[PDB]
Symmetry: D2
Subunit: 220 residues, 4 copies
C-alpha cells in the first residue's frame, strides 16, 4: 500500500499515477474530495481517498486508523507557498503557511512513528530546495521548510536501528511554490510530471543501496 498526501494536484497526484500504472495500490489524501475524485478516477488500482486537514492531529489519527493494511510507502507531499518581503507579509497568511507545511508534516510523521516505527515503511518527505538555503522574499517559507528538515533529521536519529526509514526529497523550480520578482510571461518550470518521473525512478531501489536524499532542479 502507498499512502500519498497532497495527492489532489501537483507532484502528489503525478506520483499517484506512476505508482498506479505499476499496478500498485494507492490511498490518496488532500483537502478537496472533489479534486481527489478526479485524480482517483484516472487510476485503476486505487483503494480509496479521503479529504483531510493534516493540520488537525485528530484528522491525521483518523486517516491512518481507517486504513485496511500497513502501508509500505508513505509519501508526504502536502504544503503550500507564500512569499514577499517579511514586512509585507500578512500574519494570517503566515499562520496558514505554518499549518499547511510544518503542522501537517509533524502530525503525519508523528502518527507514522507512533504506529509503524517497527515496520519496514519508507516515509518519503517532500520538502523544497528552500529547506537547504535562505532566500530573499521567502523568509517564512524557508522557515517552515527548514523546520521540516530539522524535524526529519532528528527523527532519523530516533529511528536508528529501526526498519522505518525517512527519504528526503528537495524539489526546486516547480510551479508548486516559486517566486519571481520579474520576468517574461510564464518551460518556466520543472513540470510535476517530470519531477515525479525522476523521484519515482530514484526511489525504485532494486539492490542493497537506497537513495536517502535527493534534490531535483529545473535546468535553465
Amino acid at each position: 500500500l502507498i499512502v500519498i498526501t497532497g495527492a489532489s494536484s501537483g507532484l502528489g497526484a503525478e506520483l499517484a499515477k506512476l505508482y498506479d500504472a505499476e499496478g500498485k495500490a494507492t490511498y490518496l489524501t488532500g483537502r478537496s474530495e472533489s479534486k481527489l475524485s478526479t485524480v482517483t478516477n484516472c487510476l485503476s488500482n486505487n483503494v480509496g481517498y479521503r479529504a483531510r486537514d493534516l493540520a488537525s492531529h485528530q484528522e491525521v489519527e483518523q486517516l491512518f486508523e481507517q486504513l485496511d493494511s500497513i502501508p509500505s510507502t508513505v509519501v508526504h507531499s502536502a504544503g503550500s507557498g507564500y512569499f514577499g518581503l517579511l514586512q509585507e507579509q500578512d500574519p494570517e497568511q503566515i499562520q496558514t503557511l505554518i499549518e499547511n507545511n510544518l503542522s501537517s508534516a509533524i502530525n503525519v510523521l508523528r502518527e507514522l512513528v507512533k504506529r509503524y516505527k517497527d515496520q519496514p515503511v519508507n516515509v518519503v518527505m517532500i520538502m523544497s530546495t528552500a529547506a537547504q538555503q535562505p532566500k530573499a522574499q521567502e523568509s517564512t517559507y524557508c522557515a517552515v521548510k527548514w523546520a521540516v528538515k530539522g524535524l526529519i533529521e532528528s527523527v532519523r536519529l530516533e529511528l536508528k536501528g529501526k526498519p522505518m526509514k525517512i527519504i528526503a526529497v528537495y524539489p526546486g523550480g516547480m510551479a508548486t511554490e516559486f517566486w519571481e520578482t520579474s520576468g517574461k510571461s510564464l518551460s518556466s518550470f520543472m513540470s510535476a510530471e517530470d519531477a515525479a518521473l525522476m523521484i519515482h525512478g530514484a526511489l525504485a531501489n532494486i539492490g542493497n543501496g537506497y537513495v536517502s536524499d535527493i534534490t531535483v532542479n529545473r535546468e535553465g
Copy 2:
C-alpha cells in the same frame, strides 16, 4: 534604549542586568508582570516593563507602538523547551512550542523590520545550538529553532544595504534544554554581552556559547 524580550528569567533577565550595570536604559517584556517586576528590582536604569504574549502579532505591534524612542538594540530571548521521542510528544504542547518559539520570533522580527529597517538597530536573535544540528528527543524543538535560523538568514538577505543588522546567538549546554555541570544564564550572559561588539567597520554577527 535596549528592548529585551524573554526578560522575566534566564538569559534575557541576566542580559538586562549587564546592560543596566553599564548605565544603559532597558525596556523589558516577558509573560509574567510579576517576574518582570522582580527583575526590575535588580536594576537602576530601567525605563519600564510590560507583560506581552509575543505569539500575538497585535500585542507585538503595541509593544513597539508605546515606545518613546527608537531602540538601539533589541534582544529577542523569548522561547521555551519541550522534549521527548516524537511519538511520545503531545500535539497541544507541540503547538505551544511552535507559538513560543517560531511565531514569537516571526512577529518580533517582522515588526522590527517594518518599523526600523532603515535605522541602526542591532537585532539580537537568541536561538539554540539545536538550530544548527538535529538531536534525538528534540525533534520539534530542533524544528522550531531551525525554523528561526532560516527566517533570520533569509531576512539578512532582505536587509542587504540597510543599517539594521541581525546578530545570531546560539547557546548550548544550559539547564533549559535538559531532558551543576551546565553553563549558567549569568555566565552565558556575560559571554554574549562581552562578545557583542560593534567596533570600527565590523561586528560580531554570529556567536555560539557552549559549556566545557
Copy 3:
C-alpha cells in the same frame, strides 16, 4: 562519450560496467595501467583507457587534449580513504590523501570548465557522506571531502546560465559494496524534460 576517473577499481569500475551494459561508449582513467586493462577487457563498447596522476595538472590537461570528442558525461570517482585519530595519522599519508582526493577533483573540474563549460556536459562529482558531516577518526577524510563540496558548490555559482551542470553524489561508506552504490547511483541520475537530479545521497 562517458569519461570515468577512478575507474581502476571500486565504484568507478562498477559504473563503467553499467554504462557499457546499456551500449554507451566509455573512456577510463585511473592510477593503475594494469587494473585499467583488466576492467576494460570486460567491456564491449569501451574506446580506451589511460593511466594518469590526477594530482598533476599537466597529466590532466593531456588526458582531455588527447580526446577526440566533447564528452557528454564525466564521472569523477577518483579518491582514497585514510583513517585514524588525528594524532595517530602519518603526515606523509595525509599528504597522499589531499593529492588523491582534493588535487584530483580540482584539476579535473578545472580542466572541464576550461574546455567545456559552454557545452551540455553532465559532470558527476562523487564525494562521500563524509562531505556533509564531521566524523571521529576521519578528520582528514572529512577535510578533503568537505573541500570538494566547497569547490563544487562555488563552481556551480560560476556556471550560472551555462549549459554545463555539476551533479553531486554522496555515497556512504563502501558498508555498501561498490557494486550496490553504482547500481543506485546509475539508477537515480536522470535528466527528464525541463529538469535533472542535481544531488543524491546513497546509503545501505
Copy 4:
C-alpha cells in the same frame, strides 16, 4: 602563554599586540623572520618568535618541541587567491592548499598530539568562505571548508578532554585587521562553566 601563527602581519600581528598590552606572554610564528622582528619590537612581554613553514610537519614538530605548555594557540596563518576556476594558476592553487589546509592540519595535529590532555584553547581562524560557496573563490572555499571539516571532526575526538577548539570566521577583511583583532580578542572568553566556541565577525 599565547602562541600565535600567521603573526608576521595582518590579523595575527594585531592580536599579538592586544594580548601583549594585557601583559600576556606571546610566542609568534610566521613566514618571515624580518616581519616578525618588526612586530615583536612593539611588544614588551613577548618570549620569542620564529619563522616556520607550517606546510612542513617537521618544522611544526620543531616549533612546539623548542617551546612551556601554551594556554591559548591562535592559528591565523593562511592566504587568499581568487578568480574564476579556469583562470586560476594550478601552482598558485597548490600554494593555497599548502598555506591554508596543510598548515591547519599540521598545527592542529601537533597540538592534539602534545597537549590534548591539557586545558589549551585552540583558536582556529578560518573565513566566512568556510560557511558558504562563493563565485571566483572556489579553491579558497575548498581550503576553508576543508579546515572546518577537520576541526568539527577533531572536536568529536576531543569530547571529554580539556583541550577546546574555538572556530572563528572573519568576513570582509573593508574590516581592518585591527578591528577584526579587537572584536575577536574581545569575544573569546572562558567564563564560568562555559566558553565562546564559535564566532563570526563581519564588516558593517
